[PDB]
């Protein structure tokens, strides 16, 4: 039974690569992180920075989350990310994703002690 912080790591961290270098990156990563078990998760972002750099965002710019909560933080610098989004021809169990690599600021919600990311809100 997964902690919120561990779920964030599984869904959103990929420090092992600097960027998505292939159109099939999302198909592979969404499957290997178990995000296509039982359903195709429609949208998911992977961050290509160290865990420490992503955890550090919880001490950066405090901003509102989309849902109105005030525990969101925007990274001061841009970060390498990959957005994964289901295509129109995707349907479980043959989930299919579009891969879009970008360099953007990330916005995360933080909670707990230690105070770490638990939700990926957006990128800018
Ligand atoms: Cl898992
Ligand atoms: Cl996401
Ligand atoms: Cl401020
Ligand atoms: Na947690």
Swiss-Prot record:
<comment type="similarity">
    <text>Belongs to the pancreatic ribonuclease family.</text>
</comment>
<feature type="active site" description="Proton donor">
    <location>
        <position position="119"/>
    </location>
</feature>
<feature type="binding site">
    <location>
        <position position="10"/>
    </location>
    <ligand>
        <name>substrate</name>
    </ligand>
</feature>
<comment type="function">
    <text>Endonuclease that catalyzes the cleavage of RNA on the 3' side of pyrimidine nucleotides. Acts on single-stranded and double-stranded RNA.</text>
</comment>
<keyword id="KW-0325">Glycoprotein</keyword>
<keyword id="KW-0456">Lyase</keyword>
<feature type="glycosylation site" description="N-linked (Glc) (glycation) lysine; in vitro">
    <location>
        <position position="37"/>
    </location>
</feature>
<dbReference type="GO" id="GO:0050830">
    <property type="term" value="P:defense response to Gram-positive bacterium"/>
</dbReference>
<keyword id="KW-0378">Hydrolase</keyword>
<keyword id="KW-0540">Nuclease</keyword>
<feature type="glycosylation site" description="N-linked (Glc) (glycation) lysine; in vitro">
    <location>
        <position position="7"/>
    </location>
</feature>
<dbReference type="GO" id="GO:0004522">
    <property type="term" value="F:ribonuclease A activity"/>
</dbReference>
<dbReference type="GO" id="GO:0003676">
    <property type="term" value="F:nucleic acid binding"/>
</dbReference>
<feature type="disulfide bond">
    <location>
        <begin position="26"/>
        <end position="84"/>
    </location>
</feature>
<keyword id="KW-0732">Signal</keyword>
<feature type="glycosylation site" description="N-linked (Glc) (glycation) lysine; in vitro">
    <location>
        <position position="41"/>
    </location>
</feature>
<dbReference type="GO" id="GO:0004540">
    <property type="term" value="F:RNA nuclease activity"/>
</dbReference>
<feature type="binding site">
    <location>
        <position position="66"/>
    </location>
    <ligand>
        <name>substrate</name>
    </ligand>
</feature>
<feature type="binding site">
    <location>
        <position position="7"/>
    </location>
    <ligand>
        <name>substrate</name>
    </ligand>
</feature>
<keyword id="KW-0971">Glycation</keyword>
<feature type="disulfide bond">
    <location>
        <begin position="58"/>
        <end position="110"/>
    </location>
</feature>
<feature type="glycosylation site" description="N-linked (Glc) (glycation) lysine; in vitro">
    <location>
        <position position="1"/>
    </location>
</feature>
<protein>
    <recommendedName>
        <fullName>Ribonuclease pancreatic</fullName>
        <ecNumber>4.6.1.18</ecNumber>
    </recommendedName>
</protein>
<keyword id="KW-0255">Endonuclease</keyword>
<feature type="binding site">
    <location>
        <position position="85"/>
    </location>
    <ligand>
        <name>substrate</name>
    </ligand>
</feature>
<dbReference type="GO" id="GO:0016829">
    <property type="term" value="F:lyase activity"/>
</dbReference>
<feature type="disulfide bond">
    <location>
        <begin position="40"/>
        <end position="95"/>
    </location>
</feature>
<comment type="subunit">
    <text>Interacts with and forms tight 1:1 complexes with RNH1. Dimerization of two such complexes may occur. Interaction with RNH1 inhibits this protein. Monomer.</text>
</comment>
<feature type="glycosylation site" description="N-linked (GlcNAc...) asparagine; partial">
    <location>
        <position position="34"/>
    </location>
</feature>
<keyword id="KW-0964">Secreted</keyword>
<feature type="binding site">
    <location>
        <begin position="41"/>
        <end position="45"/>
    </location>
    <ligand>
        <name>substrate</name>
    </ligand>
</feature>
<dbReference type="GO" id="GO:0005576">
    <property type="term" value="C:extracellular region"/>
</dbReference>
<keyword id="KW-1015">Disulfide bond</keyword>
<feature type="active site" description="Proton acceptor">
    <location>
        <position position="12"/>
    </location>
</feature>
<feature type="disulfide bond">
    <location>
        <begin position="65"/>
        <end position="72"/>
    </location>
</feature>
């Amino acid at each position: 039974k997964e902690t919120a912080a561990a779920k964030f790591e599984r869904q959103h961290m990929d420090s092992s690569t600097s960027a998505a270098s292939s159109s099939n990156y999302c198909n592979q990563m969404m499957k290997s992180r178990n995000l296509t078990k039982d359903r195709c998760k429609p949208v998911n972002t992977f961050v290509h920075e160290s865990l420490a750099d992503v955890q550090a965002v919880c001490s950066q710019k405090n901003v509102a989350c989309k849902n109105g909560q005030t525990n969101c933080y925007q990274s001061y610098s841009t970060m390498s990310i990959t957005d994964c989004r289901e295509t129109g021809s995707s349907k479980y169990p043959n989930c299919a994703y579009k891969t879009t690599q970008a360099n953007k600021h990330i916005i995360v919600a933080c909670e707990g002690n230690p105070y770490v990311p638990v939700h990926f809100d957006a990128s800018v």
